[PDB]
């Protein structure tokens, strides 16, 4: 049982990983991108801070 599940469950986390690191980009770049309001030199600062 343990093995059966730990195997299935592991692939489920490996899926949750990438699906989650994605959430991280999407959150951070939607943030840097938000620098369009202040100057483009602001993007350099913002995007450097982020990416």
């Amino acid at each position: 049982a343990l093995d059966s599940q730990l195997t299935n469950d592991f692939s489920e986390k490996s899926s949750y990983f990438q699906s989650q690191v994605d959430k991280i980009r999407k959150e951070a770049y939607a943030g840097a991108a938000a620098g369009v309001v202040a100057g483009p030199f602001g993007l350099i600062i913002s995007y450097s801070i982020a990416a």
């Binding site: 949750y16 989650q20 690191v21 959430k23 991280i24 959150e27 951070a28 943030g31 938000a34 982020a50």
Partner: protein, 39 residues
């Protein structure tokens, strides 16, 4: 009514930090990173 400038500025600076982090967080998803680590 001379010191009130400092006071007003003190409060200005407070909300400064706030917006600072508020954005800094939107920019650096430590929340999401940390959470992702725990689970």
């Amino acid at each position: 009514k001379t010191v009130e400038v400092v006071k007003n500025a003190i409060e200005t600076a407070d909300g400064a930090l706030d917006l600072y982090n508020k954005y800094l967080d939107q920019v650096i998803p430590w929340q999401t990173f940390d959470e992702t680590i725990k689970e």
